[PDB]
Design a protein around this nucleic acid. Structure first.
Ligand SMILES: [Mg+2]
Ligand SMILES: [Mg+2]
Ligand SMILES: [Mg+2]
Ligand SMILES: [Mg+2]
Length: 1341
RNA sequence: GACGCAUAAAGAUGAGACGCGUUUUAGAGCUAGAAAUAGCAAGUUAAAAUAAGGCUAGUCCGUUAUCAACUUGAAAAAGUGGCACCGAGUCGGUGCUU
DNA sequence: TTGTACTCCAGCG
DNA sequence: CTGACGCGCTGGAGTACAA
DNA sequence: TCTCATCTTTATGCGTCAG
């Protein structure tokens, strides 16, 4: 009759078990279907479902964004071809046609094989005249002659296609500001404006600063040494104020016009010209010098004047590459003649032939070639150029991500200015071409769809086609940027039909303070008991404290209000810690801006304040903010408007305006904030207003308030959790279907919450400012002195990593600049391609080029010996952890390896937590579907949420040990123990039912007391318990309910029962059969070959001539019974095989299976005999041997070894020999137990041998492992038992993997033959696997 | 075991961009050569594609989630499988029931 | 001409 | 004034032999 | 790799949600 459900939910696995009130697992004769002779199968009501983990949409999003970027780049090229087409038809009408056609082979080309000129001699002359594209670019920028229009198009097409980054907002003109000689007119301007006529003893320019590094600590001392110092902070020229602005908004030092705050001249210094622009040049020349130092950082040098410095630098790279190539060839011919064939001809040994023609990168070439220069003579210049990473460089290389788009814009503008006179159409539409370069769709606009994309949100003023020239007059940008945010913020939970407040709203902060404040109780010698603060007292302390301090402690309250106002000698205050958690930060910000306290304290003007904050939180683009905020121009002056629109806010709360201040009680007439301001002597906080039935907010909230799949689709978050939710819900209701539609008494779910100590929790959750402070104090730096910061700005991860590394890069030894974090790079230590780890222990802030070089690898050995001292210097300063140092020094230990990949990631933990919480929610809503007028919900099924510590202690205290390496039976065992502990706990203490059941509630540190309470609950299972004094205590061997004589736990029969079912051999292990979805093949593109296995990259691109993809992914296999035209004298041979349907043939096969099968060469196909066989399809063979269908040409292991529980306990006990950490008598008792039972090892190996000879059929590996055991049978028990722990990989269900013994490494035995399963018995297992449909495939065909 | 705030950690979702990488073609290889080839020279760049493709034809979409078998249903979705006892090598045996 | 067995391959910052 | 008890883990390509 | 935004689940501090 009555029964219970136990669940153990994981990311790749759900465990399930059915128990009775007697803790026994039921067993039934389940009916089986199919054409087989079997009609009934005894199955046990315990098992586990296994499935592949759900993938996140990160990779799909990246592929989609790459697709859109490629489409828009092609559209840019199409616009340029359209704007050139009519003039191009005059000079060579087939130029663009050949340009599209360059990929095709000569016999497939319609035009001549030479793309540009259409004839060989002119093409050779072009390549001799312009070896690279940068020759052509520099020639078109610098020369004044009329060039061929084809070269013009090639130049601007190369410029538009590869356009560079958009991280710089300013103009950054390279025509005149790129020159470093501007120091001399800077000091002329200094002499003119500063009326003292100083001597302009001009020394070296900023190149002397850039010789070592660009920083204040070199520039200031260098310029003070070069010219005599007359004013340290007021030298007025080439300052750090003009180049790399200060960290705070500090006032100007030795001001000329006014004292105003200073910053970097990128985007926040435009409002800092109010010294003169608000009262009506060194600052214009300061902008020029900052632009100059940016260009000299980005670009090396140009000796001869030019308007295209990037092409000049590329030309210098080409010339130095040619000179070094000639020198290297001469030296290698003269000194090592035998090595020339390897370096310059063998393209697989990472030589120069491997660096151009092969796949070797720049650093691999440097590391292979570096010993060659050291052993030969005359290679000193090559050695220093290699140490600077400047030897034999290419032009298209990984560090070209740093050059901004403004350099290409200036070069494009120079080309158009040179060529406008000869071609009038260039001058007619110059701005169109510059717009084709410079246009970029804003992130707040998104895709430009027309109602056919689920990712688009933009609205448009007109239905015209969107071009970069008419983007402003078609796309309504304001509503698009609004809907960029309103589509992403959540609704209010209590009021589901309207939006939440911003975090920095004055109403939200007011509600937060008045919610925290209204429960503060004060006591003194005056009266007997603490009393709540009255509304007048609350208003007085808010006006006296919270509007005068951004952050306030209780000490200031005690010594300033209660000492002075309503004077008392000493007051004790409860309800708050040392610091109030709420603060009126926005009030202080707007008081600092507006300079009108009365304006903020007014009640009538609260709505415009709210809309101002809503605007300032929604929008961030400058024109947009002033567009919305111009309505308030009749209250605010122009300067205070220019200051207020800078106050950027981000973050939104959880409640709505109607909730906190819109709805009113029908009797009292007060809002929720009105009650928090004053509620008489009740002083009710927010939860008390929303749950007291006296106030009328409650039923208003209830008036404010279907199949399973749509109940899943509407819940937000990652789609990966939906897989686990759906699988476990299907498990649950299938189990209810199994037991005759009867609901359980209770469902026990193993939830991943813990309990820990108050001190431990507070130590693990302290603010990161304390971390930075004690680390910097330990290493004794002064970085915090020069760059002040608070705890709030460390939320930004780049600034946090900058303070973590003590202002320096930790890959190379140079000082970082805090104001230029846009170009520095945050990289993962263990790369994203290998292991998913976004922890702070895996993140480095480094320079961009050094990250781009360190690609898809652990940082190499050389940088480890370079910076290993600084890594230890940060390690002992508690700024980086031991895991961070281990990952940083991973290259010393062999680098990337198979062992490094193996392991559990924290994303599994977070995903499991989200899953099991949602499972508890959905099962509670589904199982309890009935209610009455008086009781709001009937507890038909009590969902019980146990924590992992209780079940872990139950396993570790009664020798029910688990390891994951032998079998997947541990999930079912964990589910069973979950159910047993849950039902025994809910039966032993009926008045703790509200603690564990979902939706119910009960009423030294609090967490410490709760942790001890949870620890002391489990003791009633035990027979003898040792108290903390070391003295034992007894409990009855039969446990009872206490309030009733009903019996809850027999330490005899029930322990025998729980031992019986943990040795239970038949456990329903089901691998979910899934049709594969995703990319159809591996992304690597293989060269041309005569093989037929290459996949065509395009419809007209034959892979025999163009290459293509390989390694296709099969969606599912299909059993086909048909005739094959075999033989030269052809006859129709009837035959049955599997055929793999790939991803791109899935739609074609589903559209018409018959035509697709005759397209593959089959004929006379039986239509009704087509069986869809997905991945992990289960088949059954002789002697109970089961094979899982991995693919159409590869099988998998499908049998599970049911090892006895005594061997499992012995294997867990023999390993972890000296790390149990119990008591010495326990440790000794396990020691003698494993020493007198050392013969269990041979029994385990005999069991493994019998199981493998039965179902695995890897005889060679079996002889190998028996011989290797017989070699190492005299080893200590620890290493042995650890290696038989590894040994079950051979017998583990799944794919055959490579394990290892003591020294021998066993290669996997692959089942690359799906011929045997064609005469097998196909098993169609249900979600729980209890219902089966066995189809005998030998009767087919 | 839920909610508001403060401090954490570990993760998700969407948009806009950049730099490489891979492939085919173009960048006339020379000499000795019956040659299988050998010697020498050269190498840095460009185009096109970057999921096949799809139709509502947009500067849009196409790698997440869904998916045992059978009977209905375009699909959505609905429905289909006795119990008790004694045992255990992946489940077996015995006894009532329509 | 068809099955096997052993080793290598796999977009990324 | 409330209850008790001292979370994982490979299929396909390429080359080389048995018939 | 960069720049913008929005969330989620857990761990502590405080308050609260009931009869
Ligand atoms: Mg668990
Ligand atoms: Mg990196
Ligand atoms: Mg488990
Ligand atoms: Mg899928």
């Amino acid at each position: 009759k009555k029964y219970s459900i136990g669940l153990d939910i994981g990311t790749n696995s759900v465990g399930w078990a059915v128990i009775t009130d007697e803790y026994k697992v039921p067993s039934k004769k389940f009916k089986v279907l199919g054409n087989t002779d079997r009609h009934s199968i005894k199955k046990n009501l315990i098992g586990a479902l296994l499935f592949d983990s759900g993938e996140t949409a990160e990779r799909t999003r990246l592929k989609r964004t790459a697709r859109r970027r490629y489409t828009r780049r092609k559209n840019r090229i199409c616009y340029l071809q359209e704007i050139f087409s009519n003039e191009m038809a005059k000079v060579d009408d087939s130029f663009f046609h050949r340009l599209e056609e360059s990929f095709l082979v000569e016999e497939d080309k319609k035009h001549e094989r030479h793309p540009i000129f259409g004839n060989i001699v002119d093409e050779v002359a072009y390549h001799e005249k312009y070896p690279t594209i940068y020759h052509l670019r520099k020639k078109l920028v610098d020369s004044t002659d009329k060039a061929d229009l084809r070269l013009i198009y090639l130049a601007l097409a190369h410029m538009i296609k590869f356009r560079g980054h958009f991280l710089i907002e300013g103009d950054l003109n390279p025509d005149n500001s790129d020159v470093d000689k501007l120091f001399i007119q800077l000091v002329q301007t200094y002499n003119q404006l500063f009326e003292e006529n100083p001597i302009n003893a001009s020394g070296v320019d900023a190149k002397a600063i850039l010789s070592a590094r660009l920083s204040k600590s070199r520039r200031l001392e260098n310029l003070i040494a070069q010219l005599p110092g007359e004013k340290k902070n007021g030298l007025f020229g080439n300052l750090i104020a003009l180049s790399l602005g200060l960290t705070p908004n500090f006032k100007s030092n030795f001001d000329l016009a006014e004292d105003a705050k200073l910053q970097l001249s990128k985007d926040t210094y435009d409002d800092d010209l109010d010294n003169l622009l608000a009262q009506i040049d060194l600052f214009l020349a300061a902008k020029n010098l900052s632009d100059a130092i940016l260009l000299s950082d980005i670009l090396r040098v140009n000796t001869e004047i030019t308007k295209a410095p990037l092409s000049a630098s590329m030309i210098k790279r080409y010339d130095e590459h040619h000179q070094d190539l000639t020198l290297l060839k001469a030296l290698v011919r003269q000194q090592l003649p035998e090595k020339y064939k390897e370096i310059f001809f063998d393209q697989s040994k990472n030589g120069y032939a491997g660096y151009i023609d092969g796949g070797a990168s720049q650093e691999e070439f440097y590391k292979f070639i570096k010993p060659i220069l050291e052993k030969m003579d005359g290679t000193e210049e090559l050695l220093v150029k290699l140490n600077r990473e400047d030897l034999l460089r290419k032009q298209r290389t990984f560090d070209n991500g740093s050059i901004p788009h403004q350099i290409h814009l200036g070069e494009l503008h120079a080309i158009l200015r040179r060529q406008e006179d000869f071609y009038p159409f260039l001058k007619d539409n110059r701005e169109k071409i510059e717009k084709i370069l410079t246009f970029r769709i804003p992130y707040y606009v998104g895709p430009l769809a027309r109602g056919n994309s689920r990712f688009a949100w933009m609205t448009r003023k007109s239905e015209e086609t969107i071009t970069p020239w008419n983007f402003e007059e078609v796309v309504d940008k304001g509503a698009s940027a609004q809907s960029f945010i309103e589509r992403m913020t959540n609704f209010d939970k209590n009021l589901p039909n309207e939006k939440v407040l911003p975090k920095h709203s004055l109403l939200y902060e007011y509600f937060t303070v008045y919610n925290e404040l209204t429960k503060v109780k004060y006591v003194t010698e005056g009266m007997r008991k603490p009393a709540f603060l009255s509304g007048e007292q609350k208003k007085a302390i808010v006006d006296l404290l919270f509007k005068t301090n951004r952050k306030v402690t209780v000490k200031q309250l005690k010594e300033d209000y209660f000492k002075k106002i309503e004077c008392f000698d000493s007051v004790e205050i409860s309800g708050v810690e040392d610091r109030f958690n709420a603060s009126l930060g926005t009030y202080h910000d707007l008081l600092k801006i507006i300079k009108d306290k009365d304006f903020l304290d007014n009640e009538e003007n609260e709505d415009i304040l709210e809309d101002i904050v809503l605007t300032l939180t929604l929008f961030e683009d400058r024109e947009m903010i002033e567009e919305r905020l111009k309505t308030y121009a009749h209250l605010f002056d122009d300067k205070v408007m220019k200051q207020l629109k800078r106050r950027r806010y981000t973050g939104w709360g959880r409640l709505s305006r109607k909730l906190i201040n819109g709805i009113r009680d029908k009797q009292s007439g007060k809002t929720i904030l009105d009650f928090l301001k004053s509620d008489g002597f009740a002083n009710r906080n927010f939860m008390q207003l929303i749950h007291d039935d006296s106030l009328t907010f409650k039923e208003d909230i209830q008036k404010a308030q279907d199949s399973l799949h749509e109940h899943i689709a509407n819940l937000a978050g990652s789609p990966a959790i939906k897989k686990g939710i759906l699988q476990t819900v299907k498990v649950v209701d299938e189990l209810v279907k199994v037991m005759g539609r009867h609901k359980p008494e209770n469902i026990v779910i193993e939830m991943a919450r813990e309990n820990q100590t108050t001190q431990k929790g507070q130590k693990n959750s302290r603010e990161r400012m304390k971390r930075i402070e004690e680390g910097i104090k330990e290493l004794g730096s002064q970085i915090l002195k020069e760059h002040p910061v608070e705890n709030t700005q460390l939320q930004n991860e780049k600034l946090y990593l900058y303070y973590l590394q003590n202002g320096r890069d930790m890959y190379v030894d140079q000082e970082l600049d805090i104001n230029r974090l846009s170009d520095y790079d945050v990289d993962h230590i263990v790369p994203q391609s290998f292991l998913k780890d976004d922890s702070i222990d895996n993140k480095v802030l480094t320079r961009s080029d050094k990250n781009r070089g360190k690609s898809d690898n652990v940082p190499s050995e050389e940088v480890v010996k370079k910076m290993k001292n600084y890594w230890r210097q940060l390690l002992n300063a508690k700024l980086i952890t031991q895991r961070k140092f281990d990952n940083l020094t991973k290259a010393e230990r062999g680098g990337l390896s198979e062992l490094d990949k193996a392991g559990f990631i924290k994303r599994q933990l977070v995903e499991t937590r989200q899953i099991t919480k949602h499972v508890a929610q959905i099962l509670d809503s589904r199982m309890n579907t009935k209610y009455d007028e008086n009781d709001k919900l009937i507890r038909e099924v009590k969902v019980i949420t146990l924590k992992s510590k209780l079940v872990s202690d139950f396993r570790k205290d009664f020798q029910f040990y688990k390891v994951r390496e032998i079998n997947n039976y541990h999930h079912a065992h964990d589910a069973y123990l979950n159910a047993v502990v849950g039902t025994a706990l809910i039966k032993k203490y009926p008045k703790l039912e509200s603690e564990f059941v979902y939706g119910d509630y009960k009423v030294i540190g609090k967490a410490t007391a709760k942790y001890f309470f949870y620890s002391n609950i489990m003791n009633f299972f035990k027979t003898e318990i040792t108290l903390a004094n070391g003295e034992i205590r007894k409990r009855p061997l039969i446990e009872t309910n206490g309030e009733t004589g009903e019996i809850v736990w027999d330490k005899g029969r029930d322990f025998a029962t729980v031992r019986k079912v943990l040795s239970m051999p038949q456990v329903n292990i089901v691998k979910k059969t899934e049709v594969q979805t995703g990319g159809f093949s591996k992304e690597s593109i293989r060269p041309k070959r005569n093989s037929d296995k290459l996949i065509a990259r395009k419809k007209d691109w034959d892979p025999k001539k163009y290459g293509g993809f390989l390694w296709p992914t099969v969606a599912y296999s299909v059993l086909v019974v048909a005739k094959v035209e075999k033989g030269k004298s052809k006859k129709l041979k009837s035959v049955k095989e599997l055929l793999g349907i790939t991803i791109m043939e899935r739609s074609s096969f589903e559209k018409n299976p018959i035509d697709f099968l005759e397209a593959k060469g089959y004929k006379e196909v039986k239509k009704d005999l087509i069986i869809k066989l997905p991945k992990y399809s289960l088949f059954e063979l002789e002697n109970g041997r089961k094979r899982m269908l991995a693919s159409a040409k590869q099988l998998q292991k499908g049998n599970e070894l049911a090892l006895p529980s005594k061997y499992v306990n012995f294997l867990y006990l023999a390993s972890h020999y000296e790390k149990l950490k119990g008591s010495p008598e326990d440790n000794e008792q396990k020691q003698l137990f494993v020493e007198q039972h050392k013969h269990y090892l041979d029994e385990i190996i005999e069991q493994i041998s019998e199981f493998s000879k039965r179902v695995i059929l890897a005889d060679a590996n079996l002889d190998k492992v028996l011989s290797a055991y017989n070699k190492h049978r005299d080893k200590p028990i620890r290493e042995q038992a650890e290696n038989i722990i590894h040994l079950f990989t051979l017998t583990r269900l799944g794919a055959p993997r490579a394990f290892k013994y003591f020294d021998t490494t066993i290669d996997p035995k692959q089942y690359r033959s799906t011929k045997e399963v064609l005469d097998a018995t196909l098993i169609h297992q249900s979600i729980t696997g209890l219902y089966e449909t066995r189809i005998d495939l030998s009767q087919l065909g």
